[PDB]
């Protein structure tokens, strides 16, 4: 009877389900917070996998200040059992002595450290101190990494980075809402999500 | 009898055939055209595959102007059935809503949209508007992407980018001729090619 | 009896052996030497493989001078049979004519051209002239590149680059000693190494 409603329901479902298709895009954003109240975002869209290393100079604010921390926003059909973040030293090392450092540290940020912001999204806050660097790994949920599919995955995976400067958190927040990505505001509230709702937050 | 001629013929053939050897170099160039009449070239040489994303700030002219469009020049033993280009939005997305965007769009630039500039070369003009971004994919013609060869291909593939600024199209044109790469001049003529001719354009 | 000594011996061994674990970090550094007496270092840490192309503008000193040459320092569980360096032209080509250029040149720098600086380290000096570019390849000693392991290797390999400016060679030298990496001083002496010694250079 109410096919107008049914169609809108299917559209909502479609939006929530499209990211699970094999060549769907994923979106990871690293929001850097500065004492000034300003933010800088490193926004990555990618279809298969993302490996990020933000060096200490990239993390600096225009004024030259280092960030208090980052909000790392994971969005899409990401394998949550392998999604991870760690704050390394100025050299990108998780042990001061490189001879005993590894690809990832024994206390890498993962598991339930990533907060649920919807079925499509996780977010985590990571405090930083001076000269810290940031590493992020996100991979598509399995396999495109097996045997013959690995070839297409390698050549198909074009990571598209953007760096965005925000004057205030309000700008970050509205950016996140309109980009449909998880964000955690300064009070710790989840104020943006990838999940589409047919009536918004009506309940 | 005329072995001097035969040898020159073999040299011509060798030049035209060398790019088809498995570890041969390929060359893709993105020529950005600005209203000023100036051009900027993103010149990539690579042995196996190339994935390019040019962000909106990279595409800007020194003055700060955005390009009218790009000429994408494909050269070498490229798989023409998979070679492609697309103009994405400022975020590198082919759908404004990332949740319904994909690795490549439903109308990606490919097939006979790429103009033949010789057996070794294709070229295509792509008009751009403000904040557009550019994505290019080029892969070596099959397999180096199969099973055990994929390992060497991954580690062997060092993409060597150069960014070159030109004052006038004449500079672009002579650059393309001497670099043996396809280029399409402002009148739409193919004025450069990778194909070697023993007597030049003598017919 | 002397378990204090034994433990220190095991610690020394552990430091020397840790880099051979499958997810251990490797470290490659390209030290650029300028006529000014200043140096610039491109310092890479990575777990699986490293592909480097330093373009001519990256190689320039702040003043705008080109380097006299580079010291390439290889450290870790590197496959010394495949480790290599070459100085290409401004375009990253090992043949002026790209149609006859290849992934690596017929006289690529490898084998015993790399000087032994310990069981963990090799180093080589490479003179450069204006507009030369530099290519480096280093891979973990086998296999993580075979079949099903290639997937993890691809996603696990986050290369962490740092660019460091030094005022004098003395600064470079002490940097190399404290970073436990091979370096060859201006007299040609090996003055730094990754190898840990329980009593230092006491013999």
Residue numbers in the entry:
A (entry chain A), B (entry chain A), C (entry chain A): 13 to 75, 110 to 188, 193 to 253
The authors write:
Cypoviruses, members of the family Reoviridae, subfamily Spinareovirus, possess a single capsid layer with turrets and are commonly embedded in crystalline occlusion bodies called polyhedra, which are formed in the cell cytoplasm and mainly composed of a single virus-encoded protein, polyhedrin. The fold of all the polyhedrins is highly similar – a β-barrel core sitting on a base domain, surrounded by a common array of five helices (H1–H5).
Base domain deletion mutants of CPV1 (CPV1Δ) and CPV4 (CPV4Δ) were produced by three steps of PCR using primers encoding a Gly-Ser-Gly linker (described in). The CPV4Δ structure was very similar to that of CPV4 with the larger unit cell. The absence of the base domain did not influence the overall structure of the trimeric building block but increased flexibility such that the electron density for 40–50 residues in the inter-trimer contact areas could not be observed. The base domain is therefore a region that is neither required for proper folding of the protein, nor for crystal assembly, but fine-tunes the crystal, ‘locking-down’ the structure, often in conjunction with NTPs. In contrast in the base domain deletion mutants all major cavities are connected, resulting in contiguous solvent channels running through the crystal lattice.
